[PDB]
Amino acid sequence: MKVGIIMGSVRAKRVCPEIAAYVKRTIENSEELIDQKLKIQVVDLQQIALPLYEDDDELIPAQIKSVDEYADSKTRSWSRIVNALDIIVFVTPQYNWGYPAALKNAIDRLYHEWHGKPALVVSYGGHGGSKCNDQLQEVLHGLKMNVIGGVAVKIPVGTIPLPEDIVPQLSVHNEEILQLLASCI
Amino acid sequence: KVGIIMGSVRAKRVCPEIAAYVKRTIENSKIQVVDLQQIALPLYEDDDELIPAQIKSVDEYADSKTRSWSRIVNALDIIVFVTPQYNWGYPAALKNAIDRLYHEWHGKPALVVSYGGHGGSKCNDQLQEVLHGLKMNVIGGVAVKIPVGTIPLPEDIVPQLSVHNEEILQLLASCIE
Numbered sequence A: 001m002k003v004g005i006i007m008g009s010v011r012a013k014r015v016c017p018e019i020a021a022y023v024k025r026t027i028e029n030s031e032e033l034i035d036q037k038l039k040i041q042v043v044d045l046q047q048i049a050l051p052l053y054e055d056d057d058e059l060i061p062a063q064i065k066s067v068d069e070y071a072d073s074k075t076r077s078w079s080r081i082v083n084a085l086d087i088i089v090f091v092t093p094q095y096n097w098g099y100p101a102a103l104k105n106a107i108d109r110l111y112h113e114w115h116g117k118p119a120l121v122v123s124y125g126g127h128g129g130s131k132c133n134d135q136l137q138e139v140l141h142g143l144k145m146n147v148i149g150g151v152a153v154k155i156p157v158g159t160i161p162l163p164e165d166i167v168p169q170l171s172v173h174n175e176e177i178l179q180l181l182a183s184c185i
Numbered sequence B: 001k002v003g004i005i006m007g008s009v010r011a012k013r014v015c016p017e018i019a020a021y022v023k024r025t026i027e028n029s030k031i032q033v034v035d036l037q038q039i040a041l042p043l044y045e046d047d048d049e050l051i052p053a054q055i056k057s058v059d060e061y062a063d064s065k066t067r068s069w070s071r072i073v074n075a076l077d078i079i080v081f082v083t084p085q086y087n088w089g090y091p092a093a094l095k096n097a098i099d100r101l102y103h104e105w106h107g108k109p110a111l112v113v114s115y116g117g118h119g120g121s122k123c124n125d126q127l128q129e130v131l132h133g134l135k136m137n138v139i140g141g142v143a144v145k146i147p148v149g150t151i152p153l154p155e156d157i158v159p160q161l162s163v164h165n166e167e168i169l170q171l172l173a174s175c176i177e
């Protein structure tokens, strides 16, 4: 079944891909999970480029029951991508003790596509991005997602790309990410 | 100098009515209703590679739209965030605008007037935490209940928004001095 790794950052130079790459390759090389052949998709919101100010729909997304009911075509396309996901791993930075606007914008554009789906929040920042993790988990709860958990990944702020010597040390989180993902499958 | 920053940029929106309620609530005891639709700070288009916390003055911003946005914000004395609650959180348009600046928020008093089916209290809490992180002097927050799905608001509801007069006025008059 499909695992969507949704990146939160859309900054031109950013750490998000490195974290998303770690999460992808952690699931892939996992011994428990090599058998369940999960298919993995890294979703780049910089590439989707979901508009902030233009939105043809005037109905609340909760009021929308299916994809064809959306007046907006860019929403419908984003609706398909997310609907095709069975498990979602949000890989997100923390901006000012909160979640990035690009991620919140994309999350808020949809509704029924999130329902009941397991969601793991992998945050990152100077102190793991714990405050963003906390906040985003609550937004996922509001969407009635099955919030598996949240892992907070410490990085050295200001250093892109990550040092050679810290990349290996991301793998301290391997056991928790895998125990959480596996018991869900 | 008091700025009422609207959080919603939806085409059909309740936000301007609540901003109007807050405005006329104040001046019925120097306002500026800021519209982020009109300011139109881009979500994706950043010239700036510099994190706004590293920026010591407006000039360092490589972005023209950011410099003007800084100008507007840095000028203000008191800020009242009038914001809806989207899925137990704050709107992206408001978070995007907030995150583009840093030093301009330092020490500024800020009151959050949220709204929603139950006053948008969850958004109010979440936004206050972000404001705390920007080292703003957070007065507090007031949750304004609305009927949801009817825009503009049912006319009978607009007067009864004034239940929140006491609290907004109490919280505001204290900070004035």
Ligand SMILES: Cc1cc2nc3c(=O)[nH]c(=O)nc-3n(C[C@H](O)[C@H](O)[C@H](O)COP(=O)(O)O)c2cc1C
Binding pocket: A009, A010, A011, A013, A014, A015, A016, A017, A093, A094, A095, A096, A097, A098, A124, A125, A126, A127, A128, A129, A157, A158, B051, B052, B099, B100, B133
């Ligand atoms: C707008 C802004 C806000 C930030 N806020 C925080 C924060 O509150 N806590 C933290 O630990 N790092 C914060 N950072 C530093 C980020 O951890 C760092 O820039 C990281 O690279 C952001 O992730 P990204 O490169 O994938 O966008 C912030 C950076 C910027 C851009």
Ligand SMILES: Cc1cc2nc3c(=O)[nH]c(=O)nc-3n(C[C@H](O)[C@H](O)[C@H](O)COP(=O)(O)O)c2cc1C
Binding pocket: A060, A061, A108, A109, A142, B008, B009, B010, B012, B013, B014, B015, B016, B084, B085, B086, B087, B088, B089, B115, B116, B117, B118, B119, B120, B148, B149
């Ligand atoms: C993205 C989306 C999610 C929403 N989530 C909530 C919700 O979590 N709780 C709530 O009380 N209202 C929620 N609202 C309903 C709003 O209260 C109502 O639509 C309001 O008019 C939105 O404010 P605005 O018109 O100024 O943008 C949501 C609205 C939208 C657009």
Ligand SMILES: [Ca+2]
Binding pocket: A134
């Ligand atoms: Ca917590």
Ligand SMILES: [Ca+2]
Binding pocket: A134, A135, A138
């Ligand atoms: Ca919490």
